[PDB]
């Protein structure tokens, strides 16, 4: 059904299918196309997959592959690349709605960047939209520490000198990041590769809970529960069999039990058992690559 030469698109589709409010929205976009005249391909795959769930309770993912200058023949590619390509192809909504929101709400946020000259003490604010957080795995051992390193007070010194136009000289500054709008689900991208070209096999203790209030701009009270992980399995940047495990969202006895999408085999594990796998207590082979944090 799923021949093992498309190991990135398969994992991305399996992770996205369980995202909240995705299968419902895509059906609406196709319904607008339905009476007005990639969207037509996604709706076809969703219908086929839902047919198999009835039995348990050849999918042919190549239909999307044909529709989606970097995808020729049997090759090896990245997962975040195809995720961004799909989320960019999904443009179509704006073009359809102009003639008279599934990404702007699900996967979209805003940041605030503050730079402070250390000579005149004058601040500057800019706004930049973010779709994922690239976080340093380890410095040249905690998710909170890594996020703090990504977004906290950091001084640019040495050859990297801020050019302040209030002083008209090369001064020293400090930088900060703040979150303004947080999407429905927040994805974290781990920079496993090391420039030193290499790959670090020491994972991070990823918590099953999260709270973004120290680095936030406004006082908010909401948590973040992990619900999907995409894991590599190789030892270098040349190849590797991608694997994805997704929590069950909402069948009579499977609730609260993580899944494990291996190569053409579906295995049901337990939350306590799975949590002891990617943790660094036992040296693993698979290294987490992306983490998806559904709200609540």
């Amino acid at each position: 059904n799923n021949l093992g030469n498309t190991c990135y698109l398969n994992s991305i589709l399996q992770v996205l299918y369980f995202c909240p409010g995705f299968k419902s929205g895509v059906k609406h976009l196709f319904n607008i196309i339905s009476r007005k005249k990639l969207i037509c391909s996604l709706q076809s795959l969703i219908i086929s997959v839902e047919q198999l769930q009835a039995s348990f309770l050849a999918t042919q993912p190549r239909r999307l592959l044909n529709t989606l200058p970097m995808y020729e023949g049997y090759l090896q590619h990245d997962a975040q690349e195809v995720l961004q390509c799909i989320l960019g192809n999904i443009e179509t909504c704006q073009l359809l709605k102009k003639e008279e929101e599934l990404v702007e709400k699900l996967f979209q946020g805003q940041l605030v960047l503050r730079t402070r000259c250390l000579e005149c003490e004058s601040l500057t604010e800019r706004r930049e939209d973010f779709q994922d957080i690239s976080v340093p795995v380890q410095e040249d051992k905690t998710l909170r520490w890594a996020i703090s390193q990504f977004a906290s007070v950091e001084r640019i010194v040495g050859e990297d000198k801020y050019f302040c136009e209030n002083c008209h000289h090369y001064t020293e500054a400090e930088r900060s990041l703040l979150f303004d709008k947080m999407p429905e689900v927040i994805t974290i991208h781990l920079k496993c590769f090391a420039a030193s070209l290499s790959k670090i096999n020491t994972p991070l203790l990823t918590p099953l809970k999260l709270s973004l209030e120290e680095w936030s701009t406004k006082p908010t009270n909401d948590s973040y529960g992990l619900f999907a992980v995409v894991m590599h399995s190789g030892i270098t940047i040349s190849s590797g069999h991608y694997t994805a495990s997704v929590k069950v969202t909402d069948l009579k006895e499977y609730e609260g039990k993580w899944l494990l999408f291996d190569d053409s085999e579906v295995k049901v594990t337990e939350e306590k058992d799975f949590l002891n796998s990617l943790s660094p207590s036992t040296s693993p082979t698979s290294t987490p690559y992306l983490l998806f944090y559904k709200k609540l």
Partner: protein, 75 residues
């Protein structure tokens, strides 16, 4: 102009890009200050990959803009 770049370790690198160049010139400067081949770099700005063969005026990059540097991990 002057723009910032966040490398793999998380440090910030400063470039004077002169916003009339292509992506290849920016990648060449990044490789000069970083020693990474230009065929393996993935520049990301505002949650959207920077494609080669285009200038910077289309991406409305102005003042101090942070470009995230990531590599490509194949599988």
């Amino acid at each position: 102009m002057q723009i910032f770049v966040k490398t793999l370790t998380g440090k910030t690198i400063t470039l004077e890009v002169e916003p009339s160049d292509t992506i290849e010139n920016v990648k060449a400067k990044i490789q000069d200050k970083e020693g990474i081949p230009p065929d393996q770099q993935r520049l990301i700005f505002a949650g959207k990959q920077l494609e080669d063969g285009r200038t910077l005026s289309d991406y409305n990059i102005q003042k101090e803009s942070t470009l995230h540097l990531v590599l490509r991990l194949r599988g």
